[PDB]
Amino acid sequence: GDSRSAGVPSRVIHIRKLPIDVTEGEVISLGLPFGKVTNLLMLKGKNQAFIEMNTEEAANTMVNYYTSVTPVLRGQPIYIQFSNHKELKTDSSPNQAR
RNA sequence: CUCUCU
């Protein structure tokens, strides 16, 4: 289906193409001016990420900002959309408890 | 490098 693209979405955005060894400190310092960012995630083995945010309007402005700014991945555009999900969580595996 | 799957 077509459900990859948003139309009335929520607070997690997703990023592709990511740098060779980019860090959370950079990604959150790029989401901080917008609301608070509640979180991020790193699909780092595919060079992809999520960026989850504390307010729907912050993230609407954050994605529209990234549709405006493009912050340039050292010599190419940066590839953003709202997520296939709502509300990111990042807790540890069942093994750690055991 | 389009979604937390390999």
What are the sequence ranges of the domains in chain A?
1-98
What phi, psi does A66 have (nearest 5°)?
A: -80, -15
Structure tokens, A73: 């991945």
Assess whether A50 (CB) lies less than 7 A from strand B.
yes
Nucleotide nearest to A14 (CA to C1'): B3
Report how this structure was experimentally obtained: NMR
| CA of residue A79 to C1' of nucleotide B2, angstroms | 9
Do residues A49 and A14 lie in contact, with contact meaning Cβ atoms separated by under 8 Å? yes
Cα–Cα distance, A87 to A66 (Å, whole number): 20
- Cβ burial of A54 (10 Å; 0-12, 13-18, 19+) is middle
- Hey, CA dihedral for A65, A91, A19, A7, is it positive or negative? negative
Q: How many CB atoms lie within 10 A of CB A6?
A: 13
- Cβ burial of A73 (10 Å; 0-12, 13-18, 19+) is middle
Assess whether A83 (CB) lies less than 7 A from strand B.
yes
Which CATH code is given to the segment(s) A1-98? 3.30.70.330
Assess whether A89 (CB) lies less than 7 A from strand B.
yes
Q: How many CB atoms lie within 10 A of CB A42?
A: 17
